[PDB]
């Protein structure tokens, strides 16, 4: 998937 820009 297209990346999640949150802090994970």
């Amino acid at each position: 998937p297209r990346g999640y820009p949150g802090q994970v």
């Epitope: 998937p1 297209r2 999640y4 802090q7 994970v8």
Partner: antibody
Framework: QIQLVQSGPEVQKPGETVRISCKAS????????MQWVQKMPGKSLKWIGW????????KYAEDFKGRFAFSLETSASIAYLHINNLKNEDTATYFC?????????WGQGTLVTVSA | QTVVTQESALTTSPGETVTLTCRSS?????????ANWVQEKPDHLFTGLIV???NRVPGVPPRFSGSLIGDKAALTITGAQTEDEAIYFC?????????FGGGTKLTVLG
Amino acid sequence: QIQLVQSGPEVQKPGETVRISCKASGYTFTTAGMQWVQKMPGKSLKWIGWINTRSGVPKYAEDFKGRFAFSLETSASIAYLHINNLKNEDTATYFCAREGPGFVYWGQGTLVTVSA
Amino acid sequence: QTVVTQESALTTSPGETVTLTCRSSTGAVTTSNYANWVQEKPDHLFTGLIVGTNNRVPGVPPRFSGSLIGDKAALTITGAQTEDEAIYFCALWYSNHWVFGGGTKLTVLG
């Protein structure tokens, strides 16, 4: 065990400010973002934004930008939600929830009632 | 507007496979939407169940799983139990915003 514990219920007048705390334990605070969510009475949930716990950089939903702000006390593993210039419509239960992606562990919620 | 919709309410007997769905008004749900499923019990006790479409939150019972079904996100409870009577909310990361569904009241007949 990962736990998020929020401060108690608040009753405030319109125009005032409320501050809600969210104390995290069971994991290293700076390794996951913290999100905030609003649930107005009898309605579904709205995302307020998140704050990066390593850099302190917040991201705010457009519908909350302005009167709603996030801060950290990192050394104590506490995240805060501040709401300024309170409006009657801010009356809701507010939740902190840890990343992620999204909303993995949830605080117990904090009821805020805004009334004159 | 991005509107996320869920079944209003579903009723099941214990032991059945029940599937809840989560649709976007603006397009297909894909793994790029990092679908989340959360459970609310009384009162406003929220538990995260699934994140990132299909990642079970550690400690959540094995009967919960997430997937995609057609154009929608899905939560499957394989063998519903009476403790699963709750309201289930999905959230989608859609156009770089978290948007929540309206919740599904699930009754698991006790």
